[PDB]
Design an enzyme around this catalytic site. Structure first.
Site, PDB file in Angstrom:
ATOM      1  N   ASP A  64       2.149   2.537   3.378  1.00  0.00           N
ATOM      2  CA  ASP A  64       1.489   3.670   3.149  1.00  0.00           C
ATOM      3  C   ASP A  64       1.156   4.417   4.556  1.00  0.00           C
ATOM      4  OD1 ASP A  64      -1.021   4.982   1.621  1.00  0.00           O
ATOM      5  OD2 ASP A  64      -1.497   4.483   3.720  1.00  0.00           O
ATOM      6  N   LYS A  65       1.090   3.722   5.749  1.00  0.00           N
ATOM      7  CA  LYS A  65       0.463   4.235   6.972  1.00  0.00           C
ATOM      8  C   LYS A  65       1.610   5.175   7.428  1.00  0.00           C
ATOM      9  CE  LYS A  65      -2.578   0.592   7.818  1.00  0.00           C
ATOM     10  NZ  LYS A  65      -3.775   1.279   7.487  1.00  0.00           N
TER      11      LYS A  65
ATOM     12  N   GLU B 220      -1.064  -7.900   1.635  1.00  0.00           N
ATOM     13  CA  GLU B 220      -0.889  -6.674   1.777  1.00  0.00           C
ATOM     14  C   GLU B 220       0.063  -6.254   2.770  1.00  0.00           C
ATOM     15  OE1 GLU B 220      -3.689  -4.084   3.283  1.00  0.00           O
ATOM     16  OE2 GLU B 220      -3.012  -2.409   2.423  1.00  0.00           O
TER      17      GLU B 220
ATOM     18  N   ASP C 291      -9.793  -2.552   6.975  1.00  0.00           N
ATOM     19  CA  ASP C 291      -9.146  -1.512   6.218  1.00  0.00           C
ATOM     20  C   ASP C 291      -9.453  -1.702   4.806  1.00  0.00           C
ATOM     21  OD1 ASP C 291      -7.667   0.883   5.972  1.00  0.00           O
ATOM     22  OD2 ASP C 291      -5.674  -0.146   5.728  1.00  0.00           O
TER      23      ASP C 291
ATOM     24  N   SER D   2      -7.238   4.280  -0.997  1.00  0.00           N
ATOM     25  CA  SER D   2      -6.984   2.791  -1.243  1.00  0.00           C
ATOM     26  C   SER D   2      -8.282   2.219  -1.558  1.00  0.00           C
ATOM     27  CB  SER D   2      -6.531   2.287  -0.006  1.00  0.00           C
ATOM     28  OG  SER D   2      -7.406   2.131   1.015  1.00  0.00           O
TER      29      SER D   2
ATOM     30  N   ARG E 100     -15.934   3.342   3.261  1.00  0.00           N
ATOM     31  CA  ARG E 100     -14.803   2.678   3.918  1.00  0.00           C
ATOM     32  C   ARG E 100     -14.812   2.627   5.408  1.00  0.00           C
ATOM     33  NH1 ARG E 100      -8.930   4.648   2.272  1.00  0.00           N
ATOM     34  NH2 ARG E 100      -8.466   3.071   3.762  1.00  0.00           N
TER      35      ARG E 100
ATOM     36  N   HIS F  55      -1.350  11.003  -0.459  1.00  0.00           N
ATOM     37  CA  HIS F  55      -1.332  10.188  -1.482  1.00  0.00           C
ATOM     38  C   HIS F  55      -0.701  11.176  -2.881  1.00  0.00           C
ATOM     39  CE1 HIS F  55      -4.361   6.935   0.204  1.00  0.00           C
ATOM     40  NE2 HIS F  55      -3.179   7.106   0.940  1.00  0.00           N
TER      41      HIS F  55
ATOM     42  N   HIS G 189       2.349   8.257   5.587  1.00  0.00           N
ATOM     43  CA  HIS G 189       1.340   9.145   5.798  1.00  0.00           C
ATOM     44  C   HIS G 189       1.960  10.097   7.092  1.00  0.00           C
ATOM     45  CE1 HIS G 189      -2.019   8.798   3.162  1.00  0.00           C
ATOM     46  NE2 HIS G 189      -2.001   7.421   3.382  1.00  0.00           N
TER      47      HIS G 189
ATOM     48  N   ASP H 174       0.688  -1.090   0.016  1.00  0.00           N
ATOM     49  CA  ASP H 174      -0.117  -0.049  -0.001  1.00  0.00           C
ATOM     50  C   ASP H 174       0.877   1.309   0.041  1.00  0.00           C
ATOM     51  OD1 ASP H 174      -2.156   2.041   0.683  1.00  0.00           O
ATOM     52  OD2 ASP H 174      -3.152   0.458   0.992  1.00  0.00           O
TER      53      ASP H 174
ATOM     54  N   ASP I 133      -1.034   0.426  -4.477  1.00  0.00           N
ATOM     55  CA  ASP I 133      -2.682   0.647  -4.963  1.00  0.00           C
ATOM     56  C   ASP I 133      -2.523   2.119  -5.530  1.00  0.00           C
ATOM     57  OD1 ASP I 133      -3.741   1.901  -1.624  1.00  0.00           O
ATOM     58  OD2 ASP I 133      -1.562   1.532  -2.401  1.00  0.00           O
ATOM     59  N   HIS I 134      -1.614   2.998  -5.066  1.00  0.00           N
ATOM     60  CA  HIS I 134      -1.375   4.461  -5.606  1.00  0.00           C
ATOM     61  C   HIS I 134       0.203   4.870  -5.166  1.00  0.00           C
ATOM     62  CE1 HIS I 134      -1.746   5.264  -1.259  1.00  0.00           C
ATOM     63  NE2 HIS I 134      -2.918   4.537  -1.338  1.00  0.00           N
TER      64      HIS I 134
ATOM     65  N   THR J 205      -7.884  -1.985   1.874  1.00  0.00           N
ATOM     66  CA  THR J 205      -7.406  -3.202   0.694  1.00  0.00           C
ATOM     67  C   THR J 205      -7.663  -4.530   1.202  1.00  0.00           C
ATOM     68  OG1 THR J 205      -5.425  -1.715   0.849  1.00  0.00           O
ATOM     69  CG2 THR J 205      -5.363  -3.826  -0.333  1.00  0.00           C
TER      70      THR J 205
HETATM   71 MG   LIG Z   1      -4.070  -0.760   2.526  1.00  0.00          MG
HETATM   72 ZN   LIG Z   2      -2.993   6.082   2.492  1.00  0.00          ZN
END
Ligand SMILES: [Mg+2]
Ligand SMILES: [Zn+2]
Ligand SMILES: [Mg+2]
Ligand SMILES: [Zn+2]
Lengths: 449, 449
Positions: free
Chosen positions: B327-328, B322, B153, B102, B166, B412, B331, B51, B369-370, B155
């Site tokens: 990602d987390k 995953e 989450d 996501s 979500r 993102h 951030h 992610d 994912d991005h 994903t």
């Molecule tokens: Mg994720």
């Molecule tokens: Zn994110």
């Protein structure tokens, strides 16, 4: 040849809101791939460089000009893709320097050896290394060097010059900056002097300004470099018209085009990104440059002329095409300028692809020297740096951000990035490679010794 | 007997400061690529998602951990690569939204349809679309869903849940944010509730917390979801030994691993990046997180246990894995967390590749994912955002920068990014594609209708 294919349509198939509507593929590619692989020797090589053109820049430019579901007929049409690394070396220690400049990166693909930022055609030990242009020439092929920047600029400069510093534009600067290269200190000479010595059959770009400096030593001492040029058999041209007159280019009458004092003009203009600009200010639509000129060749134009003249050589040719200004507009935080120069490059890629498609023994490679600052962020983003919102072709807003320098110049970045190729030996860019590998890939396809 | 070769070693071949020492290739890749092309059907699918793991996050982690000239034996070893786009849609206009979340991205790969940021398994009209997982199960294939984040989450959720938001983790949140999906208002349920109906054979990750909520209606009204799952015949494990002890997992004995109240522990500790952190502060050296534990299975471990269990299935299997925390922590502006989580992913990838090499009919996909905030910049950079210097494997300093948000969270990013694959139908990832194409690629590869 229908033999070696290119991607003709990688745009969204139908309705993006509908199932499968955003698909770029129409079927299984296994066959097309197999048909794209050839170990046969390359007759010609055309190398297209987008200075600072990472994946971010390409994406931002497609979104704007073609829409997210759009497709670059040039840039995106290459079937064989990969990701390459371009870190430089630290001069004192020989350890990696994660973020490179165009001097060191250009030196890497042109000679096959890592170097330190600032360096043209020399290793960390300041020792010269032959370039792919010098080699192809030696092998008797036609050689072309085309760019939108000054020809003393790092990018084109690396094929023809060997200096310990990219700032050594002319004699004045060399004597100061690169004394060991200075013609008078026994050196090989300044970037421009070395360019003239190299003698590619075709050289088109800017930087006419340094051609006014005067030789300090040597045969042409006291004359202008420009003067030394015609003195040397070189044909000089300064406009589209003249550039078009040219019926032949070679070692007898090599071609040298100086379409500008410094860098050639940018295709599109727009305001500069500003702090919170996507919020405090309205969406921008880019303005073509009214001061671009019918008498100035576009890159796709120098490209086509370059190809026609170099293609008359039966042994083959090597061509380097640089879209200079992408990197420079990125530094300036000017989305509109950065984007238009990407679109400018795509046109040239198209020309190169068209020729290769029909020729059949041509290897075309599209890539960048390093990554840049630009990022695509959410529209309501509140960034610490410089932002701007843009009205894309999809009728929506795209926001670009440059947050890596408080200084007046946005910095390069070290992310690995896209490399794409079409033709014989193009499989050599697939997967993970290094910038230096490109040298060996190219010299190997042509069979250079 | 690996019919199809994976890339055993693309690290720099020798001395990085010498001619050709920085090369990653030892020769022409033509034959090997030719050997990577197969259109035979796929018995199994293993899709690995990092992610927010863009090309930048990958470069950064390699430099830190393996050195610039290093090579991720997992991540960098997939021979077929390309770049993919993952824009989402604006709910109202139906026009592209340049930077996805996501939720809408996993929906894209799992259902073949673009949707709005926040949506799970539904389109812009909120219609539900069957997921690649639900479709595999239907065909009789064994199914797996493994992640280091909470199982609620986006994903992992996207594979077994269809909801307008979500945020609708469990009964309580659903009633408030997804009133149309709420069990008590005749809906299909909350994410956790549909996850339980989805009945994948293997489900491993975090999010134990939400299982403490009680159903508001149905057959299990008033019991917690944990009890409902026990009631429905799920095998519950919450530690690495309990998981190892597992010998079976099927439609009769579905497996449910809940190893953390929320997200699983991150692999490495380090301090948060800060303003002018690479200047006002000394270089950071990542350190293993003591909490990472022995009672806690790692991503590589669950991936191994899942393939074991899923592999029993004659017809085959589809497994999603995953690495959530990349990602987390991105951030969060925490380089050590981000990089540690990417290293974890590489280990999971190696496991998948080893099995795949062996099996011969397995398609392995590695992508994200991005894109994200992270940028690698010059050591001397003077940035408006959050920076930090790091001591890498090369014994050099690398500076990481996060400058796209003045908010607590970094954003993102919109850039297209690497997608890589190995096995039958792998070619479908080469060139430019869309995230939605991946849905179609795994479908045809597994022969679904
Ligand atoms: Mg994720
Ligand atoms: Zn994110
Ligand atoms: Mg340049
Ligand atoms: Zn550059």
């Amino acid at each position: 040849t229908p033999e070696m294919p290119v991607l003709e349509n990688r745009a969204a198939q139908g309705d993006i809101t509908a199932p499968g509507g955003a698909r770029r593929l129409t079927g299984d590619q296994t066959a097309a791939l197999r048909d794209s692989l050839s170990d046969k020797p390359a007759k010609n090589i055309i190398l297209l460089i987008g200075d600072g053109m990472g994946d971010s820049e390409i994406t931002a430019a497609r979104n704007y000009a073609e829409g997210a579901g759009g497709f670059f007929k040039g840039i995106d049409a290459l079937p064989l893709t990969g990701q390459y690394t371009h870190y430089a070396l630290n001069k004192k220690t020989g350890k990696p320097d994660y973020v490179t400049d165009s001097a060191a990166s250009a030196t890497a693909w042109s000679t096959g050896v890592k170097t330190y930022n600032g360096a043209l055609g020399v290793d960390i030990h300041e020792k010269d290394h032959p370039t792919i242009l010098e080699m192809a020439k030696a092998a008797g092929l036609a050689t072309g060097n085309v760019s939108t920047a000054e020809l003393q600029d790092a990018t084109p400069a690396a094929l023809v010059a060997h200096v310990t510093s990219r700032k050594c534009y002319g004699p004045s600067a060399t004597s100061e900056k690169c004394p060991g290269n200075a013609l008078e200190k026994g050196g090989k000479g300044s970037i421009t002097e070395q360019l003239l010595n190299a003698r590619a059959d075709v050289t088109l770009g800017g930087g006419a300004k340094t051609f006014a400096e005067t030789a300090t030593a040597g045969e042409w001492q006291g004359k202008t470099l420009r003067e030394q040029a015609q003195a040397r058999g070189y044909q000089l041209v300064s406009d589209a018209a003249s550039l078009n007159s040219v019926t032949e280019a070679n070692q007898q009458k090599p071609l040298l085009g100086l379409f500008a004092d410094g860098n050639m003009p940018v295709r599109w203009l727009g305001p500069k990104a500003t702090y919170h600009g996507n919020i405090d200010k309205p969406a921008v639509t880019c303005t073509p440059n009214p001061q671009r000129n019918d008498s100035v060749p576009t890159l796709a134009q120098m490209t086509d002329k370059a190809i026609e003249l170099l293609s008359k050589n039966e042994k083959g040719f090597f061509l380097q095409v640089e879209g200079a200004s992408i990197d420079k507009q990125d530094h300036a935080a000017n989305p509109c300028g950065q984007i238009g120069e990407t679109v400018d490059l795509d046109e040239a890629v198209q020309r190169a692809l068209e020729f290769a498609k029909k020729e059949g023994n041509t290897l075309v490679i599209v890539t960048a020297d390093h990554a840049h600052a630009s990022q695509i962020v959410a529209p309501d983003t509140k960034a610490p740096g410089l932002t701007q919102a843009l009205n894309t072709k999809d009728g929506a807003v795209m926001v670009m951000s440059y947050g890596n320098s408080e200084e007046d110049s946005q910095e390069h970045t070290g992310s690995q990035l896209r490399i794409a190729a079409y033709g014989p030996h193009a499989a050599n860019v697939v997967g993970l490679t290094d910038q230096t590998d490109l040298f060996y890939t190219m010299k190997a396809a042509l069979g250079l010794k």
